[PDB]
Amino acid sequence: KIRIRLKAYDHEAIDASARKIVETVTRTGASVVGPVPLPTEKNVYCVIRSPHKYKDSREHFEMRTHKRLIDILDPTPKTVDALMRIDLPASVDVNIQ
Amino acid sequence: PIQTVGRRKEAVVRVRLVPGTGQFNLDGRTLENYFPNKVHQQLIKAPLVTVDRVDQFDIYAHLDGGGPSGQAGALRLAIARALILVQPEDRPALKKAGFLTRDPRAIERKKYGLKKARKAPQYSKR
Amino acid sequence: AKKALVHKANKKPKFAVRAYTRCNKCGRPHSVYRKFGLCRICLREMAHAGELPGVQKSSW
Amino acid sequence: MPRKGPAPKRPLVNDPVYGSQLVTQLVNKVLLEGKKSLAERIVYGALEQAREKTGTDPVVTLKRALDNVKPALEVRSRRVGGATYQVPVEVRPDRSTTLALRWLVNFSRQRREKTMVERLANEILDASNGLGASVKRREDTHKMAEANRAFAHYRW
Amino acid sequence: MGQKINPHGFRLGITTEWKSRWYADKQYKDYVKEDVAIRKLLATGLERAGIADVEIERTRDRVRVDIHTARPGIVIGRRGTEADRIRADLEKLTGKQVQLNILEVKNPESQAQLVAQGVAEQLSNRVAFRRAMRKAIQSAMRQPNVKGIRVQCSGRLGGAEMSRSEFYREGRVPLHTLRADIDYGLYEAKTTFGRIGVKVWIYKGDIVGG
Amino acid sequence: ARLVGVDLPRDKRMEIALTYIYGIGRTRSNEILAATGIDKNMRTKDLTDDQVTVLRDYIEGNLKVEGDLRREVQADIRRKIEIGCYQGLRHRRGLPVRGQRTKTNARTRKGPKRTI
Amino acid sequence: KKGPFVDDHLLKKVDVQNEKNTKQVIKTWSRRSTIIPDFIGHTFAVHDGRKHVPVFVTEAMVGHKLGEFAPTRTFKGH
RNA sequence: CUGGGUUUGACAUGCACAGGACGCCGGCAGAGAUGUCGGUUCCCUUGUGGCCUGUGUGCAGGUGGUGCAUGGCUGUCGUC
RNA sequence: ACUCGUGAGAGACUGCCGGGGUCAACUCGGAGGAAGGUGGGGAUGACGUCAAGUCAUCAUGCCCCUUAUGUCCAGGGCUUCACACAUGCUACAAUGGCCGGUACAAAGGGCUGCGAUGCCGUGAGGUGGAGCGAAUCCUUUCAAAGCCGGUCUCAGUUCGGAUCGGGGUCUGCAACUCGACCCCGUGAAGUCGGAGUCGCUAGUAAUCGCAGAUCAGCAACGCUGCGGUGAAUACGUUCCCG
Ligand SMILES: [Mg+2]
Ligand SMILES: [Mg+2]
Ligand SMILES: [Mg+2]
C-alpha cells in the first residue's frame, strides 16, 4: 500500500498540515480522497533524568505523538508540484514508506 | 448496484452482491489461494450455509488490512449485510447464528510498564 | 569550552585521536553523554520544556 | 463472571464434515496456541484411522467413548469448621465432558506411539473398548469418590 | 509534597499555551540555549520588577520576546537607562539583536505566577505567612473573573526546621477535571535558612477554549 | 564403511553419514558430493569401491585428513598457549578465549558446576 | 576512512617485504600503526623502549596497538 | 586507578602593570598533553571599546559530603 | 453511488414496557440497536505512612579541597570470578528438523542517512547510482506462524546450539582485555525438571515476527508499540495474602 506511514510531533501541527494540504489542493481544484479510520500509537520514550539511584519514579512520561494519514491515487504533475512547492508547518517529520 | 461495507480490527471490505455462480474473486487471488487454512472457508460459508445460497449468488469482494481470519470475518459481515438488504425474510436465519453485527471484541490499547496487554511482569518473592 | 576550542574541536581536528564529545550548548569536553551531545543541565531543561527529541521522566 | 453469574455459551455452529458440538469442543481443547488447521487435520486423520480400524461411525464411536469415560462424581476439598473434607459433589454434564476431554488429550499426549494422529486414534479406540489410561483414571476417580462418600451432607 | 501533575505541563497542547513556539532543524538547540540565556539574564531584573510570563518566539535570524510585567515603572524607568540598558545587555550576551516589546497584564491578582511572586516576597519580608496567604487569597478572589483558588507555601515555614506545608484553599479547585482552564504557578523563594516552595492554583472559570 | 579411518552409520543418507569425519559435515559433504558428481539421497549400504577411492582422493587433495586436522588443532592450541598471550592464559586457566561472560557462565569450558 | 597514522616508513617496509616474500622479523620503532590493510601478518619486533620481543600479529590483533599483546607496563605485585 | 602536564587554572566576571598579537594552517621532540618553528598580523581611532597573551587580585572549579535541612519531580499502599 | 486518517452532527440518556423495589434510589428480562444498563481500553494518582528516591539534572543552608579531591593527556577498569540471587532468550523433540514452491496485517528509520536493477560472490558484502526535508527508493508491488511436495523413523539424533580451531565482512585511526555478522569443522549440558514460587477473565493467555528510543559500531535475547493465528474454566468466597 501507499500514502502513508509518517509521524509528527504535535497533534495540532499534523492536523493543521492536513487541513492546509486539503485547502491548497482544493484551491488548485484537483480532488480529495476517502478518509478511513485508523488510530495512533505510543512512541518509545522511557528515559531517565539522572544516572543516580532514580529507580523509583523511573519509567517514563508518554510523549503524545498523534499521526494522521491521507491516501491518494491517479498522479498528476500539477498536483505533485502544488504539494511539493512548500510545507507550512515543516515540523511534521514525514517519512516515505 | 447494491454495495455494503464490513469492518474488523484493522481491516475493511466492500462487496457487491449480484446473482450468478458462487465464487470469491479477491484482489488478485482466488478463493483457494486466499483461504488456505480450510477453516476460513467454512467461516465465510456459514452465512451461505444457514441459507443454502452458496452456488446461487456471486461475491466480488475488495478488502484491505488484517489477516486471514480478519478478512474472513469481514467478508462474512459483508455477506450478512447484503442478505439483510436483499432478502429481509432470511435475516433471522442469519441472526440466529451470531451474525449481522460486528463483534466488539478487538485489539485493545497496550498498557505501559507491562510486557503485553493484561500481563504483569514476573517477580519472585523476597 | 569557549568558542575557539569549540570551533577547533568540532571540525577536522589536528590529530584524529581527539574525538571527544565537545558539546555545543555548554562546550564542556567531558561530563556530556554522546547519546544526545548535550550536558545534563540543558538536556533536562529541554526534556521538561518539551523540546529535546524524546526524553522524559517518572510516570508509572 | 466470577462471583457475578454464569457465562453465555458460545453459539458455535456444528462441524461441517462431522456436525458434532463435542467434536468441535475437543478440537478447541486440543488446539495448540493457534494451530487451528493443524489440529483440525490431526483430528480428521485420527478419526479416519479409528474408522479404518473399527468400521463404524466415527462420531458415534467418539460419543460412546465419551459417555463411557464420563466421570459421574468428582471429588473436591472444602474447609468446614476448621477441618478439610474431600466431600464429593454432583458434577454437571458440561464439566464432566470437559474433564473427560482433558483426560483424553492428556493420555493421548502421554501415549508413546509413532505420530500424534496414531496416538489419538489408539487413545480413542482404547476409550471405546474400555481398556485405556482414561478409563483407568475414571475408575480411580470413582473409587476415590466412593471412599470419600462418607462426608456428603452439606450441599452448600 | 503530592504527586499531582502540573496542569500546565499536562495541557500544554490542549488548554494552555507554550512559552517557546518555534521549530528548527539542528538549530533548536541554539534556539533554546539563547532562550534560557535570556531567561537567566532577565531573572533578577524582572523578578524585582514583577514578572508573569516571558513568551519567546523565533523569526528569520531574529527574536521576538514578550514579557508580562505586573508593576510597570521599575523595569521601564528613564528611556535609555534601564530598558535600553537591559536590551543592550541581552544583545551583547547573545549573537543577534533584541526588539524587546513589553506587554502589560490586565490584573496581577488573576495571574498565578504573580500571586506566587507576591506571596514569596511577603514571606521573605519577615511577615506572617498565614496572613500573607490570606490577603493574597482575598485579593485573588475579590472578583477578578475567578471561581477558585488554592495557595500552598511548603518548605521551612517561619524559618523553622520542620517542612510545614500549609494547605490553604478557597472555592472550587478541581484537578481531575479537564475543562478547568486552571492557571498554575511554581516559585522557589530563597531565605537565610534554605529554600521554600510556592505552589498556586487559580481556577478562573469553566471555559472550554476549543 | 572405512573411508579415512572412521566408520559411517548403518542406514543414513550420505550428507549425514559423512559427518562422522572430523573435517566433514552436512554442508561440507553436500559440497563434496556436488563437486564429485554423486547424489546425496543414497544410503550408507550401496557404496562402491571406485566412489570410495575417488571421494578419498578428492578430500585428500582439497582438504586434509581428519587426523591432520586433529593434530593441527592441537598444535595451534599448544602454540598459542606457549607464546604467552591472552588466549594462552585463558586456555591455561580453563576460561573462555573470545572474551565473554565469566562471572557465572562459561561452565561449558570450566567443566561441571563445582562449588568450594 | 581518512589517512591514518600508518607510519609511512613501516608501511613501505612491509610493502617491500610482501613484494620480496621473505618470512623474517621486521624491526619496528612505532607502536600505533596497525591500520592499513597492506600488513599481511608481517611479524614486527616492536620497541617498547626496553628491548625487542618477537610477537606475531593475529586476526583479532588486527587493529590493536603493536606493543599490547603482553602487558607493556611490567607489573605483577608479587 | 597507573604516570606526564595546565594549574588565576579546560572554563565565566569586577579591579591593575605592556602589548599589538592572540586567534587561524602545517613541520620537529613525544603515547599525547605539552614546548618550539614557519605564512597573516586586528577591527575603532587617541579617549580608548572588543581580544587574549605573561604577572597580581578578589575567585572559577567540586560527578566531595550532608535528601535525619529543603525546592522541584514521583514509586508501593492504591485507581482502594 | 462505494471504508469519511479534517471538522461537525446523529447514535446510550434505564430512551420505553413488565417482574420488582417503600410504587424514592436501584436490580433482571424484553423491543429497536454496533455496542443497554460507568459499551471494550487508557490519560486522570486526595489528605498522608515508608524521616520514601534524588545535594551526580539543577538550585540548595553548613563543612571541607585550592599549587589540590579543578582540568587534559597515554594505558587499564566499570565487561575481572573457585560461587549465590533476579529477570529474559535457546531449547530438551515428530503439533518436530531440512530443502523447493506460495497470502494478507498496522506501525516508520531517512540530508553527510536510506539506498532498489546490475557486475561477482555459499555470505557478511568490494563497484555504485535512478529516487528522497518527504510515496517513484530498501523496511520489497510487505514478513513469520499459515498451505503443497520430498526426506529424516521417534534417537543425545538432520532437535538444541554454546566453548574451541581455520577462511572473512560493517563502523570508525585504533574491536583478545575492545560489538555485531558470515562460511567450514569441532557437537558439551538439556530426555519438560524436586522443596518453593510467578503471570493470565476475551481478542486475555499462548504463540510469531515487524518497528523504534540512542550509536559512524553494536552487548538489545532487554524496554516500549503493532498486529498474524488465536484456546479451556468461571460450584463459590469455607479458604492463603491485601
Ligand atoms: Mg553518598
Ligand atoms: Mg534515609
Ligand atoms: Mg529420546
UniProtKB/Swiss-Prot annotation, chain B:
Keywords: Ribonucleoprotein, Ribosomal protein. GO terms for molecular function: RNA binding; structural constituent of ribosome. The keyword Cytoplasm does not apply. It comes from the Bacteria. One of its GO terms (cellular component) is small ribosomal subunit. One of its GO terms (biological process) is translation. Belongs to the universal ribosomal protein uS9 family. This is Small ribosomal subunit protein uS9.
Swiss-Prot record, chain C:
InterPro entries: Ribosomal_uS14 (IPR001209), Ribosomal_uS14_bact (IPR023053), Ribosomal_uS14_CS (IPR018271), Ribosomal_uS14_sf (IPR043140). One of its GO terms (cellular component) is small ribosomal subunit. Keywords: Metal-binding, Ribonucleoprotein, Ribosomal protein, RNA-binding, rRNA-binding, Zinc. The keyword RNA-binding applies. It comes from the Bacteria. Its cofactor is Zn(2+). Disulfide bonds: none annotated. Zn(2+) binds at residues 23, 26, 39, 42. Binds 1 zinc ion per subunit. Pfam families: Ribosomal_S14. Binds 16S rRNA, required for the assembly of 30S particles and may also be responsible for determining the conformation of the 16S rRNA at the A site. This is Small ribosomal subunit protein uS14B. The gene is rpsZ.
From Swiss-Prot, chain D:
One of the primary rRNA binding proteins, it binds directly to 16S rRNA where it nucleates assembly of the head domain of the 30S subunit. Is located at the subunit interface close to the decoding center, probably blocks exit of the E-site tRNA. One of its GO terms (cellular component) is small ribosomal subunit. It comes from Mycolicibacterium smegmatis (strain ATCC 700084 / mc(2)155) (Mycobacterium smegmatis). The keyword rRNA processing does not apply. Keywords: Ribonucleoprotein, Ribosomal protein, RNA-binding, rRNA-binding, tRNA-binding. Signal peptide: none annotated. CDD domains: uS7_Bacteria. This is Small ribosomal subunit protein uS7. GO terms for molecular function: rRNA binding; structural constituent of ribosome; tRNA binding. Belongs to the universal ribosomal protein uS7 family. Part of the 30S ribosomal subunit. Contacts proteins S9 and S11. One of its GO terms (biological process) is translation. The keyword RNA-binding applies.
From Swiss-Prot, chain E:
Disulfide bonds: none annotated. Residues 38-106 form the KH type-2 domain. GO terms for cellular component: cytosolic small ribosomal subunit. One of its GO terms (molecular function) is mRNA binding. GO terms for biological process: translation. Keywords: Ribonucleoprotein, Ribosomal protein, RNA-binding, rRNA-binding. Belongs to the universal ribosomal protein uS3 family. Binds 2-aminothiazole antibiotics, which are antitubercular agents. Part of the 30S ribosomal subunit. Forms a tight complex with proteins S10 and S14. Binds the lower part of the 30S subunit head. Binds mRNA in the 70S ribosome, positioning it for translation. This is Small ribosomal subunit protein uS3. It comes from Mycolicibacterium smegmatis (strain ATCC 700084 / mc(2)155) (Mycobacterium smegmatis). The lineage of its organism: Bacteria, Bacillati, Actinomycetota, Actinomycetes, Mycobacteriales. The chain holds residues 1 to 210 of 275 of the full protein.
